[PDB]
Design a protein around this nucleic acid. Structure first.
Ligand SMILES: [Cl-]
Length: 345
RNA sequence: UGUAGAUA
């Protein structure tokens, strides 16, 4: 009834302390008002022993609190930097049900905060439970954040088991790249793993490149390869893009992949794309012109002009300079050449 | 004129 009292007149118990909660800790932590009370005390208190007073109750009730809408914040308090002395004890209170906690919307925030804060030995202890559920966890609306946090905050060698999951079967990298949650995992791996680790992952992506490039999620995976891959990877992608410039530029998702080449590419990469754009193609219109008539590829043409050298832009201008009035009437064509007005003055 | 993650 301490909670019921305190909820009634909060001002009347302005001298309430953490050490006063004792057995009431479970009831407080699962209450909107009471959990805000614990939290504000934990953050404002400068008494190490007041903070310690509730910790035995937090540990005793860990399982009931980690996935409570209000209690999860109370558990997270003991994973913060002022609480090292409690990390090992708190990890051990939750370690055995980590494989379930990773899928739960409140408990997974506790796992993310622990990985965010605790030392590498304890991280590895937590990862050892993730091992059991890792493939399903990567695709999960909750679990993918726990995996993303592991990749960002643990040294590369201790997440090799996550890379071998991305590589467990022929189709796994495709399956993850096209998944709305698994694709974030591929992306962090590209950002944080060693080249030893990323090289097979990028190799797998390349095998089904066209598909992944035009997927509503895979196109970000390909964009991360462009940004974080090797020179040789960029050349493979630019070479594929250049040789199918029209197909890539006219589809919704893959058109962002060309734009990404045009941003992260060296002068000689851009020259391959400008060259394909301006190629004769026998009697048909040059690809750059056709692209300007397209709903997605006109943004690609605009990005070409913004990113290439003056010498490269000169070839685009000498290729588009006849076909203009035709383009003026085409759907939104008035707008498209308006934005290119600068370069035709 | 065109794309993306779970807390009071
Ligand atoms: Cl394969």
């Amino acid at each position: 009834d301490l909670l019921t009292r305190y909820r009634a007149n909060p001002a009347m118990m302005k001298n309430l302390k953490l050490s006063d909660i004792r057995g009431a800790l479970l009831k407080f932590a699962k209450d909107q008002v009471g959990s805000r009370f614990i939290q504000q005390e934990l953050a404002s208190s400068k008494d190490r022993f007041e903070k310690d007073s509730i910790f035995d109750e937090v540990v005793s009730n860990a399982d009931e609190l980690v996935d409570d809408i209000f209690g999860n914040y109370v558990v997270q308090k003991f994973f913060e930097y002022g609480e090292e002395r409690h990390w090992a004890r708190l990890v051990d209170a939750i370690i055995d049900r980590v494989p379930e906690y990773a899928f739960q919307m409140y408990a997974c925030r506790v796992l993310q905060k622990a990985l965010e804060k605790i030392n590498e030995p304890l991280q590895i202890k937590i990862l050892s439970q993730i091992r059991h559920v890792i493939h399903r966890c990567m695709k999960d609306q909750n679990g993918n954040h726990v995996v993303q946090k592991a990749i960002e905050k643990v040294s590369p060698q201790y997440v090799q088991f996550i890379v071998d999951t991305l590589l467990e079967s022929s189709n796994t990298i495709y399956e993850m790249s096209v998944d709305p949650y698994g694709c974030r995992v591929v992306q962090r791996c590209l950002e944080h793993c060693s080249p030893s680790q990323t090289k097979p992952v990028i190799g797998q992506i390349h095998k089904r490149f066209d598909e992944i490039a035009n997927n509503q999620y895979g196109n970000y995976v390909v964009q991360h390869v462009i940004e974080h891959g090797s020179e040789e990877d960029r050349m493979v992608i630019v070479t594929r893009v250049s040789n199918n410039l029209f197909e890539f530029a006219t589809h919704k998702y893959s058109s962002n992949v060309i734009e990404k080449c045009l941003e992260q590419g060296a002068v000689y990469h851009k020259s391959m794309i400008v060259g394909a754009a301006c190629h004769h193609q026998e009697g048909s219109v040059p690809i750059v012109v056709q692209m300007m008539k397209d709903q997605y590829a006109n943004y690609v043409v605009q990005k070409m002009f913004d990113q290439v050298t003056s010498e490269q832009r000169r070839e685009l201008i000498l290729t588009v300079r006849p076909h203009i009035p035709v383009l003026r009437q085409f759907p939104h064509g008035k707008h498209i050449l308006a934005k290119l007005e600068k370069y035709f003055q």
